[PDB]
Structures are given as structure tokens and as C-alpha cells.
A paper describes a structure:
O-linked β-N-acetyl-D-glucosamine (O-[name]) transferase ([name]) and hydrolase (OGA) control a dynamic, reversible, and tightly regulated post-translational modification termed O-GlcNAcylation. [name] possesses 13.5 tetratricopeptide repeats (TPRs) at the N terminus, which harbor all currently known ID-associated mutations (Lubas et al., 1997). In [name], the TPRs form a 120-Å superhelix, which serves as a potential interaction surface for substrates and binding partners (Jínek et al., 2004, Zeytuni and Zarivach, 2012). Recently, mutations in the N terminus of human [name] have been associated with ID, namely, A319T, [name], R284P, and Δ155-177 (Bouazzi et al., 2015, Niranjan et al., 2015, Willems et al., 2017).
The ID-associated mutation [name] (Vaidyanathan et al., 2017) is located on [name] helix 7, distant from the active site. To investigate structural changes attributable to the [name] mutation, we determined the crystal structure of the mutant [name] domain (TPRL254F). Diffraction data were collected to 1.75 Å and initial refinement starting from the TPRWT structure required substantial rebuilding of the terminal TPRs, an early indication of considerable conformational changes. In wild-type [name], L254 occupies the interface between the helices of TPR7, with its side chain constricted in a pocket formed by the surrounding residues N223, L225, Y228, and R250. Mutation of L254 to the bulkier Phe appears to be accommodated in this pocket, however, by causing small changes in torsion angles of the residues lining the pocket and by displacing [name] helix 7B away from helix 7A by 1.5 Å. Increasing shifts of the TPRs starting from the mutation site lead to a maximum shift of 12 Å for the N-terminal [name]. The melting curve for TPRL254F was shifted, yielding a Tm of 55°C, indicative of reduced thermal stability. In sTPRL254F conformation 1 (sTPRL254F-C1), the F254 side chain occupies the same position as observed in the TPRL254F crystal structure, while in sTPRL254F conformation 2 (sTPRL254F-C2), the F254 phenyl moiety interacts with the side chains of N223, L225, and Y228 and the backbone of the F224 and R250. Thus, the [name] mutation destabilizes the interface between TPRs 6 and 7. The data presented here show that the [name] mutation causes a subtle structural distortion at the mutation site that propagates through the [name] superhelix, resulting in a substantial displacement of the N-terminal TPRs and a markedly increased structural plasticity compared with the TPRWT.
Author numbering: 58 to 400
The structure:
């Protein structure tokens, strides 16, 4: 009568599973597992408060019921009771501290709540329990990464993929940290391994294209940016990034087309406004350059480059005092501009 509740649940025949669990409580209001089997039905229906109450009842009857604490934590996370779920996981680990998957889920919750040092401890203990548990190595990487510790982030992602060579998310995390560290040939390798498992991943294509650009492989960047657009076409940053690579190559006409595409999508795209103004400036259409830098500054008043570039075009027009104001505000915002000017 509880095995039949639990059998129907494995088949997701939830009406029949709830019927069989409700009968086991008409025939014994003290069996812990039947209130849990009922909670599991409510859980799959998205009736979370009902699931929680049934879980809590099962636990008031059998406080050593590990699965009650696990299922309860799930339901409290889904319902936004974050620290309740922390406590449910903590009790489960009191009763079986060898539950390394639980301990990693507990770590993930601790991470989400900004308690990076406790999360770290969870992951480390999970690893001490089960040293080959690649997820925990990867999660710990992500803690190190959020703490600015790039080397330790890399270390833990590489351990993650050595343990599990099919671990897509660990390759992506590894590529992203290598990209931040400017270790570009290793980043490329990690992105290309990710693409081996997920060939159409739009965000990885975007990051890989950026790594190629940082390397000075402009043609390869451009090809990768084009594919990134195909994969995710109606957002302006991907067009502005393509255009920046086109401009670097000297394909000015197509760069201008791409900037204009981004600006139909997003008329206040400040990078596109500035970078298109730069094409205008370089071609000698000073009036249109001025117009666009000024639009960029309306979107982003503290855009140092746009101030600098504006100042340059005003200086050419002989508007020397207005130029000077913008030179000075570029330096106020980003002082290294003064070292660029002097050079």
C-alpha cells in the first residue's frame, strides 16, 4: 500500500500514487514515508506549501528520514525559503555525512546567498568524502573565481575535466576564467572542447570570437562572430562586436552596416554610437561624428572615450574651449587618458 504509492510515483501516475499514499494514512496516520510520497506528488504539481507541510509532518514523525529532508529542501528552494532549506540540508548531513551530493547542493545554496567561505567548506568536505566527484571540483572553481582567485579557479576546473572529460559546463567555466586571465590559447582549447559537446552554443561562440580578436586573429574572429549572430540574431552587442572586428580588418563599409544594424535594434547602444562616430571621424565627416558622440554621451554621460573623441573633432572644428572641457572630463573619468594624450 506504500510500495504501490511509490511504484505509481516512479511511473508519474500521480493521481494513483496519491490515492495509494492517502489509503496508507487512512490505515495508519503514523507511517512517515506516506506523507513524504504525498509531498512528492504535490511537489511535481507545483503545490509547494502543501508539499512542505507534508514533508514537515513526515519529519515530525521520523526525524532520521534523510529523503524527507532532501525533498523538503528542494521544495523550500523552489518556494524561495532559502535558509530553511539550508537547515534541512544541515539535518540531513547530521544523519548521513557521506551524502556528498547533498553537501554539494548545500554548497550551491550557500554560494547563492553570498556565504562563499561556508560554500567552500561544503565543497571541500564533499571532495574529502568522494575525491572523484567532478561537480564539486567545478563548483569550488566557481567560488574561487568569484573571490578573484584565478589560479585556484583554473586548478579546480581542470581537475573537474580530468575527472569527467565530458563535463561541458566545467569546460565553459575553464574557458571563461582563462579568457579573464588572458591565457588565450588555453581558452580557445577549452571553448573548442565545449563546442564539441554543444556545437551551437551561442554564448561560447561569442566568447571564442573575442578570444580570437584578443589574439589578433581578426579573420577567424570575424568568422566566429558571424556564426554567433546566426545563432542568436536579434541582439545588438553581437553586431557591434562583429563590426569592431570588421573595422580592425579595414572592411569599413560592412562595419558601418553592422553598427547600423545594432542601432536599429537598440537606438541607445552607446558602443555602436561611438564606434560608428569613429568611422565618420576617420573618413572626415566631422559633423556626423560630432552628432554621434553627442548621442553616445546622452546615453552614457560618463563615457570617457566618447568625451575624448568628441574633444578631438571639436578641436578640428576650432571649437577649442568646448574641446578642452571634453579633454578634461575624459581625464577626470579615466586618468590614463592624460598618458595616452602625452604619448
Amino acid at each position: 500500500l506504500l510500495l504501490l504509492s511509490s511504484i505509481h510515483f516512479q511511473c508519474r501516475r500521480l493521481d494513483r500514487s496519491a490515492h495509494f499514499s492517502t489509503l496508507a494514512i487512512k490505515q495508519n496516520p503514523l507511517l512517515a514515508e506516506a506523507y513524504s510520497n504525498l509531498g512528492n506528488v504535490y511537489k511535481e504539481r507545483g503545490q509547494l506549501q502543501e508539499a512542505i507541510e507534508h514533508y514537515r509532518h513526515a519529519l515530525r514523525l521520523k526525524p532520521d528520514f534523510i529523503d524527507g529532508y532532501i525533498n523538503l529542501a528542494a521544495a523550500l528552494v523552489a518556494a524561495g525559503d532559502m535558509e530553511g532549506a539550508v537547515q534541512a540540508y544541515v539535518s540531513a548531513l547530521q544523519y548521513n555525512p557521506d551524502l556528498y551530493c547533498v553537501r554539494s547542493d548545500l554548497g550551491n545554496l550557500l554560494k547563492a546567498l553570498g556565504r562563499l567561505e561556508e560554500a567552500k567548506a561544503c565543497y571541500l568536505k564533499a571532495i574529502e568524502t568522494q575525491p572523484n566527484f567532478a561537480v564539486a571540483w567545478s563548483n569550488l572553481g566557481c567560488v574561487f573565481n568569484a573571490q578573484g582567485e584565478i589560479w585556484l579557479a583554473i586548478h579546480h576546473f581542470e581537475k573537474a575535466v580530468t575527472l569527467d572529460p565530458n563535463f561541458l559546463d566545467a569546460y565553459i567555466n575553464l574557458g571563461n576564467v582563462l579568457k579573464e586571465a588572458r591565457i588565450f590559447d588555453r581558452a580557445v582549447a577549452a571553448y573548442l572542447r565545449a563546442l564539441s559537446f554543444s556545437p551551437n552554443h551561442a554564448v561560447v561562440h561569442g566568447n571564442l570570437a573575442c578570444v580570437y580578436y584578443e589574439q589578433g586573429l581578426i579573420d577567424l574572429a570575424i568568422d566566429t562572430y558571424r556564426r554567433a549572430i546566426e545563432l542568436q540574431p536579434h541582439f545588438p552587442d553581437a553586431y557591434c562586436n562583429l563590426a569592431n572586428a570588421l573595422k580592425e580588418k579595414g572592411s569599413v563599409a560592412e562595419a558601418e552596416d553592422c553598427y547600423n544594424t545594432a542601432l536599429r535594434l537598440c537606438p541607445t547602444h552607446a558602443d555602436s554610437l561611438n564606434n560608428l562616430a569613429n568611422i565618420k571621424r576617420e573618413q572626415g565627416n566631422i559633423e556626423e561624428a560630432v552628432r554621434l558622440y553627442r548621442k553616445a554621451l546622452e546615453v552614457f554621460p560618463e563615457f570617457a572615450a566618447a568625451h575624448s573623441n568628441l574633444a578631438s573633432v571639436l578641436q578640428q572644428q576650432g571649437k577649442l574651449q568646448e574641446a578642452l572641457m571634453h579633454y578634461k572630463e575624459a581625464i577626470r573619468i579615466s586618468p590614463t587618458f592624460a598618458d595616452a594624450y602625452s604619448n
